[PDB]
Amino acid sequence: GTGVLTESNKKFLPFQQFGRDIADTTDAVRDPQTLEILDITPCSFGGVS
Amino acid sequence: TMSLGAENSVAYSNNSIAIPTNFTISVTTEILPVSMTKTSVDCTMYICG
Ligand SMILES: *[C@@H]1O[C@H](CO)[C@@H](O)[C@H](O)[C@H]1NC(C)=O
Protein backbone atom coordinates (compact mmCIF):
# COMPACT_ATOMS: atom_id res chain seq x y z
CA GLY A 1 0.00 0.00 0.00
CA THR A 2 0.86 3.73 0.27
CA GLY A 3 -0.27 6.21 2.95
CA VAL A 4 0.51 8.03 6.20
CA LEU A 5 1.00 5.60 9.13
CA THR A 6 0.07 6.90 12.64
CA GLU A 7 -0.44 5.45 16.14
CA SER A 8 -4.17 4.93 16.84
CA ASN A 9 -6.86 4.61 19.55
CA LYS A 10 -8.46 1.48 17.89
CA LYS A 11 -9.03 -1.34 20.44
CA PHE A 12 -8.22 -4.42 18.29
CA LEU A 13 -9.21 -7.74 19.93
CA PRO A 14 -6.32 -10.32 20.15
CA PHE A 15 -7.48 -12.31 17.06
CA GLN A 16 -7.62 -9.21 14.73
CA GLN A 17 -4.66 -8.27 12.44
CA PHE A 18 -6.24 -5.67 10.05
CA GLY A 19 -9.10 -3.16 10.03
CA ARG A 20 -11.11 -2.61 6.79
CA ASP A 21 -13.12 0.27 5.35
CA ILE A 22 -16.50 0.21 3.46
CA ALA A 23 -14.42 -0.10 0.21
CA ASP A 24 -12.53 -3.28 1.53
CA THR A 25 -9.29 -1.16 1.76
CA THR A 26 -7.12 -1.77 4.87
CA ASP A 27 -7.86 1.15 7.22
CA ALA A 28 -5.54 0.02 10.08
CA VAL A 29 -2.79 -2.62 10.71
CA ARG A 30 -1.23 -4.40 13.68
CA ASP A 31 2.58 -4.30 13.27
CA PRO A 32 3.91 -7.94 13.24
CA GLN A 33 7.07 -7.24 15.38
CA THR A 34 5.96 -4.76 18.07
CA LEU A 35 2.14 -5.07 18.30
CA GLU A 36 1.26 -1.37 17.65
CA ILE A 37 -2.11 -0.56 16.04
CA LEU A 38 -1.41 1.93 13.22
CA ASP A 39 -4.06 3.88 11.31
CA ILE A 40 -3.49 4.28 7.56
CA THR A 41 -4.80 7.51 5.94
CA PRO A 42 -4.11 8.10 2.19
CA CYS A 43 -1.39 10.58 1.17
CA SER A 44 -3.00 14.00 0.50
CA PHE A 45 -4.52 14.65 -2.96
CA GLY A 46 -6.75 17.13 -4.83
CA GLY A 47 -7.59 18.77 -8.18
CA VAL A 48 -5.15 21.31 -9.68
CA SER A 49 -6.95 24.22 -11.34
CA THR B 1 -60.42 2.79 1.59
CA MET B 2 -58.99 6.35 1.70
CA SER B 3 -61.05 9.51 2.35
CA LEU B 4 -60.67 12.24 -0.32
CA GLY B 5 -61.99 14.95 2.08
CA ALA B 6 -65.13 16.04 3.97
CA GLU B 7 -68.26 16.33 1.73
CA ASN B 8 -70.03 19.74 1.39
CA SER B 9 -73.14 20.98 -0.49
CA VAL B 10 -72.49 24.73 -1.10
CA ALA B 11 -75.72 26.71 -0.33
CA TYR B 12 -76.19 27.94 -3.96
CA SER B 13 -79.34 29.64 -5.26
CA ASN B 14 -80.04 32.21 -8.02
CA ASN B 15 -80.30 35.09 -5.44
CA SER B 16 -78.12 34.12 -2.39
CA ILE B 17 -74.58 35.45 -1.73
CA ALA B 18 -72.14 34.83 1.15
CA ILE B 19 -69.91 37.81 2.14
CA PRO B 20 -67.04 37.55 4.73
CA THR B 21 -67.55 39.89 7.72
CA ASN B 22 -63.95 39.43 9.00
CA PHE B 23 -60.50 38.10 7.94
CA THR B 24 -57.43 36.28 9.27
CA ILE B 25 -53.82 37.15 8.35
CA SER B 26 -52.14 33.79 7.60
CA VAL B 27 -48.38 33.12 7.46
CA THR B 28 -47.53 30.00 5.39
CA THR B 29 -44.10 28.30 5.06
CA GLU B 30 -42.84 27.08 1.66
CA ILE B 31 -39.46 25.25 1.49
CA LEU B 32 -37.58 24.85 -1.85
CA PRO B 33 -34.28 23.07 -2.73
CA VAL B 34 -31.81 25.41 -4.51
CA SER B 35 -28.47 23.53 -4.61
CA MET B 36 -26.83 20.18 -3.89
CA THR B 37 -23.30 19.28 -2.66
CA LYS B 38 -20.53 20.00 -5.23
CA THR B 39 -18.90 16.52 -5.36
CA SER B 40 -15.87 15.72 -7.52
CA VAL B 41 -14.52 12.22 -8.31
CA ASP B 42 -11.01 11.64 -9.68
CA CYS B 43 -11.90 8.87 -12.21
CA THR B 44 -8.32 7.45 -12.31
CA MET B 45 -7.98 7.35 -8.49
CA TYR B 46 -11.46 5.80 -7.98
CA ILE B 47 -10.84 3.10 -10.64
CA CYS B 48 -7.10 2.46 -10.07
CA GLY B 49 -6.17 3.73 -6.54
C1 LIG C 1 11.09 -9.54 17.25
O2 LIG C 1 10.84 -8.12 17.51
C3 LIG C 1 10.29 -7.83 18.87
C4 LIG C 1 10.20 -6.31 19.07
O5 LIG C 1 9.74 -5.68 17.86
C6 LIG C 1 11.20 -8.47 19.95
O7 LIG C 1 10.51 -8.41 21.21
C8 LIG C 1 11.55 -9.94 19.66
O9 LIG C 1 12.50 -10.40 20.66
C10 LIG C 1 12.14 -10.07 18.25
N11 LIG C 1 12.49 -11.47 17.97
C12 LIG C 1 13.62 -11.83 17.34
C13 LIG C 1 13.80 -13.34 17.08
O14 LIG C 1 14.47 -11.01 17.01
Instruction: Evaluate: CB of A32 within 6 angstroms of ligand 1.
Output: no
Q: How far is CA A14 from the centre of its chain?
A: 17
Instruction: Evaluate: CB of A2 within 6 angstroms of ligand 1.
Output: no
The experimental method behind these coordinates is cryo-EM
Does residue A45 belong to the interface with chain B, where contact is any CB pair within 8 Å?
A: yes
CB-based contacts of A34: which residues, under 8 Å, 6+ apart? none
H-helix segments, B1-49: 43-48
Neighbouring C-beta atoms of residue A8, cutoff 10 Å: 16
The H helix count followed by the E strand count for chain A is: 0, 4
* Resolution (Å units): 2.8
